[model samples]
Target: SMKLVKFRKGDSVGLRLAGGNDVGIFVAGVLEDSPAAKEGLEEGDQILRVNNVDFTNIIREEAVLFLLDLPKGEEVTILAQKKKDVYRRIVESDVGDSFYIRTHFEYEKESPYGLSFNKGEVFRVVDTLYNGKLGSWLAIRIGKNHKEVERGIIPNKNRAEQLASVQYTQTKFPAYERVVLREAGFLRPVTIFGPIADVAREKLAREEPDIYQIAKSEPGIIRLHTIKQIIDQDKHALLDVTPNAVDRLNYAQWYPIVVFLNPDSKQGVKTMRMRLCPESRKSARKLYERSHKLRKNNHHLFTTTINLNSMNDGWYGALKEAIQQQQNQLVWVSE
Candidate 1:
């Protein structure tokens, strides 16, 4: 089988559908074992640039296959997508490799607040975007299967604090604790231009009130909506709500208790919390408190703070090692 590489879920990339215009930043997919999968990519991510070309589109499997078939070691510079942030990475593949890729139409502009995805599912609040002076934390409720997928430091504006939290939590916990700890932060997806629009925001509430309800209470409440292609051409709009994000407050306090899906192949809690420890809780609480307090100032700041940043080097290494072992690859492109 061919190696699979892809961008992280919730990240964004440029999309070029065969018959559609080069839509700005569209959230695409990073299916398992897909070429993008081995690359560690995901869905609902934003794009920056493609193949050293300043353009992007939600191209289908045929197009992606075309690019992957280029000369081996022919590196293509792609400005990768994170959340609201954007960065660059390169993808190089050898010729004669039999692999195929696909695309979707879920692009949105970048802002301090952005959306994250898991397969076709999208995650809004990873955690708190701002944590007051104590600093902030980010979270993303990854589906159970993708929980072990670790994200590295993007070195973005918000990364310093996240990395520090990761360092601090590691010292406070044992190896086992480290395994279950939701790294207190997330690697901020590269920032992009644009806001998750108002109608779309309302739609998010209408479709997923449970999530919208939680987002309403947090700061930097950025929301995500599906592309209503047939309904209105004005599908994209940057909201100026000074939204608040959930997870910025106490998650247990905010939501009853987050129940996530797991690989029961039958049944299970996915025990996602096992990855979090008491120290991790303390860190989360600290960040949550800080973020909640900051909400008063900037009501627009909403975050889907994902806690992948809390994992230690060991956990991170193991995850990358495991994903890499499968010859899976995820690619993130910036617009």
Candidate 2:
């Protein structure tokens, strides 16, 4: 399908291209819904002529001038072959690690070698700058079916450290632990921790009859054997308390998928741990402080977080949905 298409000189062709000599300057991509698209141009359509000046025999500079150097308001006519024969120019970069990244938004203000992507998309970075560590990846967009159906390249930032990053005062475990993709099965041991955990716990207690309650005691006081016994037989245990035995539980094959929940100042456990008796209230306050202590000191250890919006619908649904996500999370040197 060869045709002549006309447009005003200032109109954006919505095109990107490659080719200098033998194969002819060709279309690599055409922005969807642009003026060129309305004129029936598409990716892979080879440019045969621009304003009848001929482009098929031209070099990169010639083609750029013919198209880009057009007068602002003059009429421009383009001749094209709808041959669908276009292809990408690529490279082999085996020096660095290959990884995938989902773009969080639209970016286009990069140099020619830089790439662009829309919000929420998975793009694969195969080539990297082992030339040095200014650190960027040569990204190629991955189609929905996990195949390379399109071609564009622009080096961008990366690493799983960039993806799931965290730190304590430091990770004696060395910052963040890498968790690969593991979908939750019929049973995934879950740990619930936060201030007002007892608040969320009691809410769960109302519906979940067979839950393991962490006895109210001094901070870090736990019987691992008994807790392990419960999880061992049940195969899945949901513990409610800011589990201080995070190191122990996770190592013993208890994949304690920890979640942190914050209290609602509106309907939170304000005095749930506070009593009129000063000494008794103070003991609960110590426990409360311990929860805050871990939450502040080790923010990265938590797998997910919820603000406890609707203590009823919010707790059950939020906690369940967090477990439902099969995403990777960062942790310490345990699970």
Candidate 3:
């Protein structure tokens, strides 16, 4: 019997930004010791263009569909920038079973607990959203420092003294094809050490503190997703408001990036987080704590997690609903 189904994991794709703020793509995750990570691809690093194709206007699901259909052995060239530096990479993929599951670390029914993006102000910054055609990398001055750190197109380790000369170029971008490794992750809230520290301090002293909120007000800054089928039903979201943007400090001056990965985007339960100010360290911490609570609230040790290969008619509706909504965005939720 032939069957028609919606989208599944293994697909190559890109994203489009709806807001004026410049982040259209999101890093799904990095494979351990993968070529993309070796090339320095990080989660949250925005993809500006691919092989000269501008993806800024793309929607998440459609983007994945495009990439999923790419011919094998094709070389993908990318132009991306992180902070003040720019990167380029050339990537090749012979696909297999490592899929991109867009899920929030939380779920429903069961109690959730322990774990976080990193338990602090640091964001896993594997890649930087670069804009070379715009004539600049969005350089973030580490608030307390003014120094240069050696970074690259692909992730690599190098001589510290030679750091001043080594420029990083990121050519390969990360993607999910049902279940194969395409990219890896990078950690961030890059420390403002060395000469860069002095520069960051000086900039912080002069820049108007109000600058953070202005960016917050920009579009796409506050992404709230839930398994609740919320967006399609109603735009208003009932989210926790503790982590407001004005309360963060670490990476305070950086862009306030927020996303809600939940099961509800299609239809089910939802785990959500409101927009906490990027500069507000206070709010980010609070948000982190709340996230922990939500996880714990859904714990079910006796219960087993479901996988695609095992799904049967009994679980089709739930699984389909969960993955479908989540597949639309880089982030998602589970139950």
Candidate 4:
């Protein structure tokens, strides 16, 4: 038995056919703006006939030649069936399916709808959309410190082409050290002990009552104390004295330096005292020189306990000698 059918579109009759016993004919290609393409004559469609002719039994060479000889500019019937889609890839994602996407390539902004995301930036997929004419699209939001929450459309074509998948994990870190120095209101100041000219020495003497008498007895040198407050801690009411005297005494050259630590205080102020020996004198000279150089660099204040023992060789020795020599004249006045 012979069977026949017709396929036509505009001036061009869509009748691509291949000859075989098992299959009648099949479409190979469709030209743009052509009648075959307009009439849904897709590639790989099997054709059964054209213009009432049974193409089922015809050879490929015979079918092609017959199609060329057919008249143009007239409508023709098409008896072809399209095959199922064969090029679709894996399903990207479903709506509300969250995933991290790292951009694999650079993208430049070309239009108002064009979004430019940097390479390696991860975005969360919030939604999905399908465009019949343009294909697939994803609605994504950039997260974390970047904090861009607005949804942006990414075309499945270039979008899928640019993104890559990623996975993350938690990182562990090591431990560290702490400080323990307690705060006290006691003021431990620094002073430079040395020679001062006559006029300057007298000016200092007039300021402190203890100063003038000490200056007369020990005229060789003086201790210049430039008292300053460096560290801020709690204030305890232990003692207050002559204001103008205390204020004036803020900066003065003492003939004999003194330590006013209470050897019986509960807070270990008792631990502070003077010890003298020959080595102590040498240490005192080293301490003076070291302190002089240190102050020059503007290192005038320190919050930590200053250990005379930790100072240069002979520092403790010299300091001990200075105090012991003035043991009689050195007066301890708490103010």
Name the best candidate (by TM-score): 2
What overall lDDT goes with each candidate model?
Answer: 0.28, 0.53, 0.27, 0.36
lDDT of 3 by residue, 15-124 (tens): 22211212344444555554455556554455555555665544333344355555555655555444212111211221111111211122121112211211111112
- lDDT for model 2: 0.53
> Could you tell me every candidate's TM-score relative to the true structure?
0.17, 0.40, 0.20, 0.22
What tens digits encode model 2's per-residue C-alpha lDDT throughout 124-220? 5544432332344455666644566554554334332343232111112211222222344334556677655554555555666464334333455
Off by over 4 Å in 3: 1-23, 83-335
Q: Candidate 1 at residue 48, lDDT?
A: 44
Model 1 TM-score relative to the real fold: 0.17
The residue-by-residue lDDT of candidate 4 on 228-318, one tens digit each, is 2121221111111222232233223111232221112222211121222222223334444444454343221211112333213243334
> TM-score of predicted model 2?
0.40
How many pairs collide in each candidate, listed in order? 115, 3, 80, 15
